[PDB]
Structure formats: C-alpha cells, structure tokens
Amino acid sequence: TSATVIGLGPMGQAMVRVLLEHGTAVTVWNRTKSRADDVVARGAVLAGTPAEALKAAGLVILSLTDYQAMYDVLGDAGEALAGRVVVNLSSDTPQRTREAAAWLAKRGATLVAGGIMVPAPLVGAEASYVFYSGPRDVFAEHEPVLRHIGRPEYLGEDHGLAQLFYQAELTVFLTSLSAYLQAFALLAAEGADPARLVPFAREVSGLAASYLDETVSQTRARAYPGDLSTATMMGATAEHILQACRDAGVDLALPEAVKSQYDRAIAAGHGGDNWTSLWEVVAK
Amino acid sequence: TSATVIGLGPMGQAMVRVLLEHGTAVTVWNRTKSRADDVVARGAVLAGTPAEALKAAGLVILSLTDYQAMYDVLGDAGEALAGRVVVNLSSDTPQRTREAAAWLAKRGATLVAGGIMVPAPLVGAEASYVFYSGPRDVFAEHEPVLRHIGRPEYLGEDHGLAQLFYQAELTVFLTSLSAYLQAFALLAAEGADPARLVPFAREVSGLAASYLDETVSQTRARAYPGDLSTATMMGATAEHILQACRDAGVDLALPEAVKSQYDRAIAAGHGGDNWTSLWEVVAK
Amino acid sequence: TSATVIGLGPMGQAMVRVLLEHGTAVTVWNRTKSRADDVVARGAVLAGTPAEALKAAGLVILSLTDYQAMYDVLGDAGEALAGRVVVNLSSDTPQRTREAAAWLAKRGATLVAGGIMVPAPLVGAEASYVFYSGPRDVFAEHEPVLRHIGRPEYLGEDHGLAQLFYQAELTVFLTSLSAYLQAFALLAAEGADPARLVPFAREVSGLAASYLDETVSQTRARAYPGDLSTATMMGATAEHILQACRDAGVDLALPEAVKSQYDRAIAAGHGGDNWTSLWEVVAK
Amino acid sequence: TSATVIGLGPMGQAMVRVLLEHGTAVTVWNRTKSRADDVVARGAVLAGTPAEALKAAGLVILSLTDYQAMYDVLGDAGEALAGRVVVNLSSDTPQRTREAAAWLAKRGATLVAGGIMVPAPLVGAEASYVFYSGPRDVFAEHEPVLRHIGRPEYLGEDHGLAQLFYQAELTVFLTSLSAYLQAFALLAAEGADPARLVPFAREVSGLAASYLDETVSQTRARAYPGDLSTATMMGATAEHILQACRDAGVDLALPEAVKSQYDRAIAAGHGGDNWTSLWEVVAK
Numbered sequence A, B, C, D: 001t002s003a004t005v006i007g008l009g010p011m012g013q014a015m016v017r018v019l020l021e022h023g024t025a026v027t028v029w030n031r032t033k034s035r036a037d038d039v040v041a042r043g044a045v046l047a048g049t050p051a052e053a054l055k056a057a058g059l060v061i062l063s064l065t066d067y068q069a070m071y072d073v074l075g076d077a078g079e080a081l082a083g084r085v086v087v088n089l090s091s092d093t094p095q096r097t098r099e100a101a102a103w104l105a106k107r108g109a110t111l112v113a114g115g116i117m118v119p120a121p122l123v124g125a126e127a128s129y130v131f132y133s134g135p136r137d138v139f140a141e142h143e144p145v146l147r148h149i150g151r152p153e154y155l156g157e158d159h160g161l162a163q164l165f166y167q168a169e170l171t172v173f174l175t176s177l178s179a180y181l182q183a184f185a186l187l188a189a190e191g192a193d194p195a196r197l198v199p200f201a202r203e204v205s206g207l208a209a210s211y212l213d214e215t216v217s218q219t220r221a222r223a224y225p226g227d228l229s230t231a232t233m234m235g236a237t238a239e240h241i242l243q244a245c246r247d248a249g250v251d252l253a254l255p256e257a258v259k260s261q262y263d264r265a266i267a268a269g270h271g272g273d274n275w276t277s278l279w280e281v282v283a284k
Ligand SMILES: NC(=O)C1=CN([C@@H]2O[C@H](COP(=O)(O)OP(=O)(O)OC[C@H]3O[C@@H](n4cnc5c(N)ncnc54)[C@H](OP(=O)(O)O)[C@@H]3O)[C@@H](O)[C@H]2O)C=CC1
Pocket: A006, A007, A008, A009, A010, A011, A012, A030, A031, A032, A033, A035, A063, A064, A065, A066, A068, A069, A072, A073, A089, A090, A091, A092, A115, A116, A117, A118, A119, A120, B228, B229, B230, B233, B237
C-alpha cells in the first residue's frame, strides 16, 4: 500500500509517522519544503511538486488549514488528479466541501471528506477517530490504510457530513476552551489564582456533559419544562457573569453572546421555560 | 437544630427537603406562597412574613434569583436581622455580594456568601459541593448543618470569593450548554439528527477538560508555543463554524464571540502561537 | 379525529384517557369487557366486537401483552382490516413484528410498529416518547394524533426497528430491576437493611450510565485497553458476588450469567483487556 | 503523615497520587515492580519487600484483586504486621473479609475493610466515596488521611459490612454494564448502530433508578400490587428479549437469567403481581 500526504503541519506529520509505522509507503509534499526534514528522516519521500505527489499514490490525504489551500496546491495538477481518491481531512464549511466534491469530480478525482477528532499526539492511538463521508465503495477500499489514523466513523454519501460533524464538534471544543479563558480571566482580574479553579472547572465540565441527553430530548420535543431551572434564573447568572467581567475589566464578547441567548428567549416569552427553550432563538 | 430558608425555587425546596431529612426544624418564606405547598407538606413551617421567617432561627439561608431579591425581601426586615447568620446561596456579582456584606453588618447580621455547584436533584448527593466565603468562625459554627447540602469548600474571609468562583464556574457551565445548542442547531439545520452527536460531544468535552492544567501554566507564563496547534489554524475553524452556521440559517452570536477572540489574538501578532495566546485579548 | 384502542391494561387505559383529553373520539375493545368501565365513564365507547372497533376508526392502536394476542383478537376481523392503519404498541421480537407486517398487509392493513418508553402514569407527560417504524407516509398522517401519547421517535421503514429498540431498552431496564433485587437480597440475607443501600444504588446507577460512551466506542473499535480496569479484576468481583450470594442463600442466576461473561472473555485471552472485551463473547 | 500502599493497579496508583498530592509520605510495594515506575517518578518510595513496606507506616492500604492476594503478599510478613492498621480496599466476600480480620488480629494488626465506589480517575474527586467497617476508634484515628481518597461512609464494627455494601453496589454496576453490552449486541446483530441507543439507555437507567424506593417498600412488605405492570407482562418482555437475542445470534446468558426470575415468580403464583414479586424467587 502507497499513500500521499499533502500538508505537514502537526497533523500531517503525525499521519505520515503512523502510516510509515504501519508499513505504508508515504510520499509527502509541503509548501514549506524544510518542514519535511523529520518525516524524510523517518522514510517519507519528499516530492518536488504536488503533481509528482499525486503520481506516487492512488490515496492522497490533504491536511491543510482550509479547502482554499487544496485549490492553491492542486489547481495546477491537471490530469494528475484523474482517478485519484482525495481524502481531505481539513477544516472548512459543509458547502465548500460539497463544492470541492464537484471541482474534484470535473477532474476525475473522488473526494472523501473527513475530520480527525484528536490532536496530533493522539493520532493513531486507541482514542483517535475520524469522521468520513463521500462514496462508500471508494472509502471502503481505502479504509484498511485510513483506519491506522483512527477509528473510521463513516457518516454517509453527502461529502458535507464529515465536515458538518467536525464543525459541530469544534463548536463544542473551541467554545469550551474560550469559556475556560473567560473563567480564568475573571479570577485573575479579581486577584484570585486560576489554578485554584482547575478541579472545580473539571467537575462542572463533567456536569455540563451530563445535560446532553436532556438537551437532545427537550429540543427534539420543543418541550422546555422549567421545574428545575428557568431561562430567567439562568439568564440572571448570564447577566451576573457579564457584569462581573465588566467590573473586572475582562473581555465581554463570550458572556455577552451567552446573555443575548437568554434575553432573546425571555423576550420571546420563555422566562418560565428551561434553558433548552434557547433552541427557539438559536435553531434555523 | 433550627434553620430558615427564604426562596423556594427548585434549589430552596431541595435544601429544605435535605435539612428536613436530617431532622432540622425548617421555617420557610416565599413571595409566591403556593411554592411552599410541597415543603409545608413535608413539615416545613410557612412564616407569614420574612421578619417572622428570620425570628425562627439563628441560621438563615437565601436561595433567590439575585441579591436585589434579597433587598426586596429583607428591605423592611430591620431588627429581625440582628444577631442572625445570612447564608446567601444566590447568583450575583462579587462587588454586589461585598456591598451586601456591608449592608447586612450595619443591621447586625453576618453574611456567609456561597454558590451551590450542582442542580437541585443532586443537592445532598455525593457530587454536591458549595463554595463559602466570609468570617471563618461563623461559617464553622453553622457548617455541621450546612454540610447536608453538599461538601463545604470554604475559600476565605472575602465575601466576594464564593460568588467569584460560582460566576467563573457558571461561565464554563452556561457557555458549554450554549455550545451544545449551537452544535445541535448546525446538525438539525442541515437535516442531520442532533442525537447522533451526543457521544462525540461528551468525548470532546472530556478532551477540552484535559487542557485545563496547560491553560493555567501557559496563561500565567504568557507562554503560547504553537507547535501542536496555532491560533491561525484554530481561528480558521472558528471562522468555518461561523460560516457553516451562516449557511444553515442558525444564530451566529456564540460562534461570532469565539471567532472575535481568534481575530483579535491574530491581529495582536499571535497567528503562530497556541490558542492559549487568546489570554492576551480575553484577560484585558 | 377518531381512534380505536384494543387492550385496556394500564397502558391501553392511559392512552384512551390522553386521546380523550386531547379531543379524539375513542372506540375501545377489551377481552375483559368489565375493564372498560372507567374509560367508558370518561367517554370512550365500548364496541361489542373487534370488527366493530375496526369500523369506528382508520387509526387502530393495539396495547396487548404480545403480538400473538393481536392474531387472537383480529384473526376474525376479515375485510374489516382492509385500509386500516394498525399501530401495534405491544412487546414482541423484531421477527414476529415483520411477520405481522406481512400478515396485516395480506388483509389490506398497514402496520406501524411502536414501543412506548414510559410506564402508564407518564403516558402523555413531557417525558413520554414512543419508537415507531413502518411506512413513513402512513405514520406521518397519524403522527398528529399519536404524538399526544408521547414524543414520536420514527426510526425508519423496517417494521422490526421500533421493537428492536424497545427490546434493547427493556434489556437495560428489566436487567437493572433484577440487579436491584439481587443487591437487596444479598443485604437482607446478611441481616443488613436494603433501605440503607438506596442512596448508593442511585449513585452507582448514575456511574454505570456514565460508561455508555466508552462502551459504544471500544466495542465499535473492538479496542479494549485495560489501563483503568481489567476483565480479570472485574471478573474477580463477578465471582465474589456469586460466592457472596451462595454464602447468603440467595438466587444465583443473575450473578452466574454476569460471571460467565468474564470467564468466557478471560478463556478467550482478554484477562488483561477492559470489561468492554466481553463484546467478543456477547455480540453476534 | 505516613502511609504504605500495597498493590499498584489503577486504584492503588490513584490513591498513591492523591496521598502524595496532599503531602503524605507514601511507601509502596507491588509484585510487578515496573507498575511502581509512575508513583516512584512522583516520589513514592518502592520497598524491596512487603515487610519493608509495612515497617514504613502505621497505616497500610491494600488495593489487590482479592483477599487471597493479601495472603500471598503478607503471608510471610509476620512481625511486620504487629501494631499496624491494614485498610483493605479489595473486592472479596463478606465471610472472607471477616475471616481476614481474625487472621490479622492474631498477628497484632487491625483490619478496616473498605470499598471505593468510583473508578481510578475519580479517586479524590467530588463524587468519590468509600465504605469502611471495623473498629470505629481505629478508623477515626486514620480517617483524616483516608478522607483524601473520597468521602468516608463508616458502616459499623462488622468488618464484612463495607465488603457487603461494595458487592451489592457492584451487583448493580457490573450487571448494568452487561445489560448495556446486551442491548448494544441486539442492535448491532440486526444491523442498527448501537450508538443510536445511547441517550435512550441513559434515560431508561434514570427511570430504573426512580423505582428504588418502591422496590424497598414492596419487597420488605412482600406486597406486590400488579395494577401498573404484572410479572406476566414484564415476563413476556423478558422472553421477547431472549427470543430476539436468539433470532439475532447474540449470547442468551444474561436475558436467560432475568427471564428465569419471571418464569419462577409466575410459576410460584405471582403472574398478576408487580415485578417486585420476583423478591419471592431471588431472596431465597
Ligand atoms: N492541530 C490539531 O490538533 C488538529 C487540526 N485539525 C485540522 O487539520 C488541518 C491541519 O491542521 P494542523 O496540522 O494543525 O496544521 P496547520 O493548519 O497549522 O497547517 C497545515 C498545513 O497547511 C498548509 N497550508 C495552509 N494554507 C496553505 C496554502 N494556501 N497553500 C499551501 N499550503 C497551505 C501549511 O503549509 P506550511 O507548512 O508551508 O505552512 C501546513 O502544511 C486543519 O484543517 C485543522 O483544522 C484537526 C484536528 C486536530
């Protein structure tokens, strides 16, 4: 088996190592040639051109910052794309992923969209998994090589799906990281030591994740009983957080955005409903 | 022992039930007199007035929407407050909690401020804990009755500490819940079942929590090595979430707040730094 | 709108009340005529024959002990089945559900299989939901009446699906109830008071449910890292439970069945793997 | 303070890390000397022998697979055990724990038996609790060091009580995990994604737990009113699960154990009684 990896950021490099360690031949290409030194020392072959990289394998894995980078790198491949399977494991919108499917198809190439759901040090570890979407038959053929990156989670035929699931996951992940900075900033601005919060922040993240099922069922039902918590009570806290952040001279964007959800829910008559009623202002 | 509980939302009623379960004699008062029906049925005594409530015990627990509600309710209490310990377990700003301590002191009452870090159904469960701050010796005299609500975490003499930790905790909690709605809305808008995300969302919450220690070290050091993940790359995803939400007709408020942190960190020169460089734009 | 309910056990009766309360006309039939007294007093009409019951509505809800009961009651309906939608909300196997689909189809009737996921007192409450499977168009038409029973969870076209999900759910529910009896019996046989276990039994059920995601991912991956728990350590406890139950003179069936899973997993070389390796002996 | 921990599976290492984190001087011993690598790296002292371990502290914590392992390890300890407090937090039968107390006493050591009711990652977390039983005054002398592992639940003087509660708890826990595998296997065998069940499984676990109080009252009274749900009807479902599992080629061990309880209760005359009538066949 033979693989090409285009993009040697931390994830591209991690995927090259894991493919090499499992006895796949790896041809790499990278805009910044010098970034390939370590993977070539581990037995990767650096191609001179993306077209060359496309000629050294039927399986082409793209690990780039966005899908626009794919067009920058592959725009000049011409017929070297014909019959290749492009596994794009890059962040972008569902719509640009679908668009890339059509662009690649015009040039005889098959897109399998994917999203890796771990950081680089966990690539190929037990806890690694990857969303995939695009043609089942084409994915199935390459699945035996791809599964070394992580557990494949094939979502279906719509190329946008893997990217949809990636952006949904990253909405949770990135906003959580911004909530941690927000929390530590409030403490640090008030003279308190953010380190003291760590064990409680871990507990309340555990508590938050435990609400996922209630969230699913109430939003799915559009039923929001306020018996244990009201949008008025939780909006009051959203406001206390915003005010406390204003008092402490800390950024206001995140707490303001959360508060706006409760205000617009209450203004819509959901003051007495569960926080899950914010569905009514958030959803399409 | 004797206790008064003022405010009978789900948390007040839960605290009353737990104190009754441990043989505490509990006097209650509520604005909406019907909400007392359940704790009166379990043998709580409904006081006619807040002053009558206060006279019932040395120990007075407030579970109200905010500290304004304290003033609306105990505003005309006067003499009833003298010699009493007011354990205020209501959401508000650290500053308003500190000013409340002053106001209470003038009327010969001590404030212990606190924050309950679990919902009503977990009051008195293994997982329950409560931040407390204020005069150590007063907290300690009442702690054997207070402990029935949850493990007491006494933070110190500053009345605003318990409130500060509670607000920082609810910054994590409320923002996480909103990120869950946001992820579910994106899926639902594109016609996928939000319930499909549930186990992956819980997993990515676990992953997010595992970054807490290195967030503390990097933000305190203002050291942001970008070798595993840059603000540019994660910023790119923050923009992808915003755009995908824009494409699907979902509310952009929360994704826009998170993207504005990356925008600002990058424009402040942290493009090649870790996401922890957002400290530079969040912490002032 | 018009509905027929055949079967006036607690669930049939609960569904009749909820349909009446939402302004649906209800015709009932029951083997035991006298069981209809309360629903007729609430405005249900008792039909003399199942054929009559079939003539008083296009929507026919079956709430019987099994699918064999359906054949007992409807076997003598002849052409009175033609064009009816039979919503069977009865326990049976996926295969007999599919078989009933064909039997009903031969007689011009459409089956929508369902399973109600709450006891009778929660029928029509916020927390009620019902699995449905069978023809989407036919289900969609009746969904506006059926949704009063609980949140419809339409799983797809295969009639067996709702029943599959019901039996899967009930595997969790019934085996949990048998584990509670098993636990209380051990305590009661040893002189201890089962009532003392209740708060800990609630905690450990919460703990158990928290392992659902790990279960999904490891069995899905067929990856069972034993870093936090081995099948040898957990099989040792399964054995201690069986022995303790033998020492106390309490039934052995449940603890023996659990122990057999770990023995067969260890015998297969999974002594050092996670308990999730029992997948390898349990799964098809 | 000083502590010895004998046994370095995940629970032993977790207890060592938590005691070290609180400034306890910890001596360790393990059969597989490599497992000590991690706690030695955090500054635990590796004793050459178990007798050397015991000499290091008045307080000796055992975290072994079973009480046989205690005998294999402390079998030749002899004089080293005199005056020492052995806090044995290992799974075994109440009888073997009681006989262990006798054996230890002869050698001039006190036993405190216990059971940790959370996994290794939650040792020292808010949710952690530990049953203890044995001499009150000895437990109490050591409880300030022991409390760092989790909230101490002292059950009384009988050394077999902590073990009895632990085994009853793990009857609930292990049987629930196996019921989860069983539900997932049924889905997987019929070609449905087990991940689809996850939120409904968690919900039905919640529902099961809500029956705990009425299980206590009905089983103690041997009063089993069948008006909401009969053993015949629930027995029918136990048989449906068994048959559906039989049809799908899934292991029948666990469904057969549960069905045998209904079979036996019905044949003992409880067909029209609540499922709680299974007490009559489980409790002897
Ligand atoms: N890092 C992580 O933890 C994870 C990241 N991801 C996703 O994986 C992808 C890769 O991320 P990561 O490995 O962090 O690396 P980066 O996104 O920081 O960089 C990846 C590669 O993109 C290349 N690149 C970007 N723009 C262009 C362009 N216009 N033309 C040519 N090459 C370009 C870079 O080239 P050069 O080296 O020359 O700069 C580099 O090789 C992203 O889509 C990201 O969202 C997914 C999960 C985990």
